[PDB]
Amino acid sequence: QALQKYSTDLTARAREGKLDPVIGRDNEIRRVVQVLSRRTKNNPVLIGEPGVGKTAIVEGLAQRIVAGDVPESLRDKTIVALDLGSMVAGSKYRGEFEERLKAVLDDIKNSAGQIITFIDELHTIVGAGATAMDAGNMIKPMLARGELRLVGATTLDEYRKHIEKDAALERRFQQVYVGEPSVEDTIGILRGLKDRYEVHHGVRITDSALVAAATLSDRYITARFLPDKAIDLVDEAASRLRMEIDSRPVEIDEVERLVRRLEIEEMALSKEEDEASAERLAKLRSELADQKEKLAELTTRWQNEKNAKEEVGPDDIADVVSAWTGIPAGRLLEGETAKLLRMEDELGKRVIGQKAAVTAVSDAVRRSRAGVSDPNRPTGAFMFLGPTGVGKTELAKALADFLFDDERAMVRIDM
Amino acid sequence: QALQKYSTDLTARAREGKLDPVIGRDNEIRRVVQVLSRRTKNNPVLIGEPGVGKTAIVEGLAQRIVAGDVPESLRDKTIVALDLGSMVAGSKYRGEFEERLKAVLDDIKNSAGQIITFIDELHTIVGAGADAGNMIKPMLARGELRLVGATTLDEYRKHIEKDAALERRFQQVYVGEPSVEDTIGILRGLKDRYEVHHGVRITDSALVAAATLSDRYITARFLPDKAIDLVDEAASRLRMEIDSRPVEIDEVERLVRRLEIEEMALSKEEDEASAERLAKLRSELADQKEKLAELTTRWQNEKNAKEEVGPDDIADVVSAWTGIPAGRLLEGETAKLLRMEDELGKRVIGQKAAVTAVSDAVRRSRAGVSDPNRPTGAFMFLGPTGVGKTELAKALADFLFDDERAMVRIDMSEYGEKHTVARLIGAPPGYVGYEAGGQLTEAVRRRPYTVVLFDEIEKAHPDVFDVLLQVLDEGRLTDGHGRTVDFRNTILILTSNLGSGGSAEQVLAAVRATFKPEFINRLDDVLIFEGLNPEELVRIVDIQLAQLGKRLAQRRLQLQVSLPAKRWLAQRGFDPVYGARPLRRLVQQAIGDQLAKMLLAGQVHDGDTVPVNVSPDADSL
Amino acid sequence: SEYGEKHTVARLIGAPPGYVGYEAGGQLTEAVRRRPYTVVLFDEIEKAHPDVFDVLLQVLDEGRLTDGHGRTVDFRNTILILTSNLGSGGSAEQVLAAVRATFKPEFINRLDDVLIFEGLNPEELVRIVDIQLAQLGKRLAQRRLQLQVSLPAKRWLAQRGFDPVYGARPLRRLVQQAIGDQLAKMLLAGQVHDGDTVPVNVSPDADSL
Ligand SMILES: Nc1ncnc2c1ncn2[C@@H]1O[C@H](COP(=O)(O)OP(=O)(O)OP(O)(O)=S)[C@@H](O)[C@H]1O
Ligand SMILES: Nc1ncnc2c1ncn2[C@@H]1O[C@H](COP(=O)(O)OP(=O)(O)OP(O)(O)=S)[C@@H](O)[C@H]1O
Ligand SMILES: Nc1ncnc2c1ncn2[C@@H]1O[C@H](COP(=O)(O)OP(=O)(O)OP(O)(O)=S)[C@@H](O)[C@H]1O
Ligand SMILES: Nc1ncnc2c1ncn2[C@@H]1O[C@H](COP(=O)(O)OP(=O)(O)OP(O)(O)=S)[C@@H](O)[C@H]1O
């Protein structure tokens, strides 16, 4: 009965239908099962970089046990998820922790080898109760005889920072290397996960969304790993779309919020007894008017669309990938096609002459938004030289301003 | 009666036949005996690396006592297994643990030496305090309690040797690991205990392989233990196969029962770009439902006319582990190896002398002919620029792993100063970055099958060469933490750009004057690359156009190219001093620029197909 | 060839008290503090930094050194061996001159005889050819595939790879390139199934099986 108090039940939740579906990864679950059913030292440890799916495999094994796809030895085994945090809760006295540990071990042993314990992030088991090495290695006699099974899973570099420093305990563990999947596999994963999200957020999701997410999340976000940085885009897109099925969409709610601030400023700046703030007001009014025009236009266009956007598509994902890691990944939604066609004449406002070099920079900027340049190569690498005072540094500073509206936003180093 | 509460009975467990047969190790047990049977200070301690068998020796001694092979000074003595953990269980009050331990010690002394206390993991005897594990120090030095302990080699000097007053009362017994010939015998003795638990049979030709094979592939662990896992796993897998269908008939069915649902929920997509994906997935499904039904037929051809493990299940296990493929070329891989300079030729063009040398040290290693202790192949190819010598090392890492970014590349141009060596080997203990290991080292210790690439090697400082000096020719280098990492399965590739135009001995003598003979001598053939003839550019043209086309299929947007343009581009591939890089700029100056201009100016939309045609000088879409 | 800086001496001696890697002790020490009958080998001693040379000062001719923990291990039963490649171009004066220029007098004075190796002669390569062939046969004896080499073959093999500037590794690479390639192409293309004894013989330039 100590188990009932110091651990939860995984297989029970698997029966009650509360674990996400698990797709693919057949070799890994096969190896986990065959290691989990050998004579001595049956303790598989899923190891590998963070995010690639290591708890998902154990959940898949649990659902598989509930279904019946397991061999004979693993029929009705009742996986158990330990918890060493709630075990060291209040034990300030001398034996209060070893007592609980002995109780749990005894109740695991009393069962006829049924229980399959599961310690998630087992790199925390090392220094369980310190004071002088005594605790956390009381299970070391039972690991060897294979009484308790203990399928665990830790990240790849907290296994050689915490455990491999304890070569006597690493010996009792078998490593199952979980490498990350490819884009073709991630698409398949998403195709089966595209229902829980689609039901939690009251929306629908096109298959093009899944494809484009699994591709862009690999092309751009080069700091995480694949089964997760692809689910995040889908999830945020769906949440945003549900937020817009509220009263108003974006790009109308932003303009009205701007208009309100401009109004509350123009109403309280009017009663200013000065002469220099007269011109500092003469522009604020014009701005308020030119913004209210846009508000009214958008509001009228919405009415037309509503009398004459309900699922996420392959471009809302681009909006997310642009809002996070501000690389523009869109599809030229008419806001800036005119701008990129005017680029030369616009960079002419600050630089004069050297059309032979302005056109060369503009072409490299242009053929990258249309999706034609090499996706794994810099967006352009020019070295323009010539005599002094001509304008080379000036063109470089004009380009950064035309792109980000702040010449202090580019990275400059003086070689 | 207090020894019943805090300890089990090893000798009784050995009487009912509950312990594994212990084989060999005569000297260790005889020394344990002749230490355990002296006047004072009669308590040994076994010492040695984890896994080499140190509880096995105590269990062997217990079975030996039960049989009666021991001398008169030990005939009819029981061994009790003390359990320090179950003594501090409830002792929150200020003296209860000391009371318990004192009762235990008094009861041990109350007998006349008919008990031999055996403490396992005795490095845990230092604590128990909060003046504990210290009241034992008097009775130790007099020989009252006969203590048999066994801790690993490096927790000894961490918990015990710190207390030279207590480590004086112990006589050390070193337990070195066995050899291959002895491990074979140990397995020959232990086989019939797994033969029962798993309802299978194990072949002696497999017992020899599970010990010869696990001695050149798994170096992070020690002997027998790293050789019993293979046998046990092979047997468990064979039993799984016996119950259900065999493997490679199970996964083919699992993925087929998934592609079904995929295409079923996909066919309901009111979309147009998703029709090219559905009509491509619907072909792999019918292709898999073909070889599945072929396997079910080829299985009955055997089931009408694989029942014990052999030297093949062991190799399959030690291959699923550690990733290293050591199998038997199961007729699907050999057909692929036989045409390798044909699958490499789809990405590298020309350089027949070099493709038939990289590809030549993979076959002669997969067939079991190469030296088992030296890298799979270590050769440097060098020549002029833009020729294809960093591309070959990527067409090769893609043939073997199906992913160009699963290999280990280090750009040796950042190693300009000699102190930049610590970047790939770690920093010695007591310094800033030490709990991080090396950087090249920790990359191979996790997957010892990658293909390392040292790009632009002559730009570095001539000390990193001397670091590499032992990587070649032995496949070993140890980092700060003192962990030896093996390279005996990687493929070492070093690019360069020396010479730059010299025919053959302006370059062969420029290598000789930048490297030392002891470094040139470890290498395999030094491959020389050659410039690009005008003929072998008309084909790179096709490769480039295919690349761009595949890049364009994100919009279902094709393009038709006429042979005049295709041979115009290749004739404007110029200057046999810059190789094949100018062509990739020519393509984007000609086609890509105006395509992108037309693409965001309306007048070209998705699904279209634009034909190129050679205007009298330029290209027109 | 890795001990190239001052601070990499703490790699074989441990760390001074109170620092990061302290419970780990030394690396040369903790393997000669137990079972002190081993053999110590320093490859390419001249690749180091001439401050590692001054730990071997009290290692040699006194037989003890003290790690970080203060313990004193004793080297009174080991056999130290240092290899190098100094000179490599002079007959007998350049090697000694380079040694005297790269080491200290109180370091060359501690050792026993500083031996010189000669360099293999054309006669001394047949006795290596048969060694290599026996080793290779032992390798491809795990499939009962023992070779059967002809005496003209052995003489050609000991005449092709000889060049007196790279020692005896060219012979190994030649054995591989000549025999192993043909054998591996013949082995996985059927026709050389196990339990076979393939003979090798001399063709004009190559040597066909
Ligand atoms: N094969 C898979 N099938 C279904 N969902 C998967 C699969 N692999 C990963 N996921 C999902 O992707 C996410 C991966 O999270 P987890 O794998 O549980 O985290 P992790 O891989 O254990 O990494 P850590 O170390 O636990 S934070 C979860 O949302 C999973 O539901
Ligand atoms: N074509 C031009 N259009 C506009 N301003 C220009 C032009 N050429 C020069 N200038 C002015 O000249 C200033 C200095 O020119 P820079 O380009 O900064 O000097 P530079 O071209 O970098 O030559 P060096 O070799 O670096 S001194 C700029 O800040 C501009 O104000
Ligand atoms: N001489 C031997 N005869 C038979 N089996 C042996 C022998 N030596 C080891 N084994 C087996 O190999 C394994 C070794 O496990 P143990 O020796 O109990 O662990 P250990 O050697 O004590 O290492 P530590 O320090 O306890 S983690 C067990 O399965 C033993 O049954
Ligand atoms: N023989 C070739 N076959 C196919 N592509 C080639 C060939 N030679 C060069 N390339 C192209 O050239 C680029 C790679 O050239 P690399 O070989 O990597 O340059 P390199 O040979 O390393 O010369 P350096 O000294 O490193 S600049 C890719 O875009 C390849 O497509």
From Swiss-Prot, chain C:
It is found in: Cytoplasm. Residues 120-209 are annotated as: C-terminal. It comes from the Bacteria. The Clp repeat (R) domain probably functions as a substrate-discriminating domain, recruiting aggregated proteins to the ClpB hexamer and/or stabilizing bound proteins. The NBD2 domain is responsible for oligomerization, whereas the NBD1 domain stabilizes the hexamer probably in an ATP-dependent manner. The movement of the coiled-coil domain is essential for ClpB ability to rescue proteins from an aggregated state, probably by pulling apart large aggregated proteins, which are bound between the coiled-coils motifs of adjacent ClpB subunits in the functional hexamer. Homohexamer. The oligomerization is ATP-dependent. Belongs to the ClpA/ClpB family. Part of a stress-induced multi-chaperone system, it is involved in the recovery of the cell from heat-induced damage, in cooperation with DnaK, DnaJ and GrpE. Acts before DnaK, in the processing of protein aggregates. Protein binding stimulates the ATPase activity; ATP hydrolysis unfolds the denatured protein aggregates, which probably helps expose new hydrophobic binding sites on the surface of ClpB-bound aggregates, contributing to the solubilization and refolding of denatured protein aggregates by DnaK. This is Chaperone protein ClpB. It comes from Mycobacterium tuberculosis (strain CDC 1551 / Oshkosh).
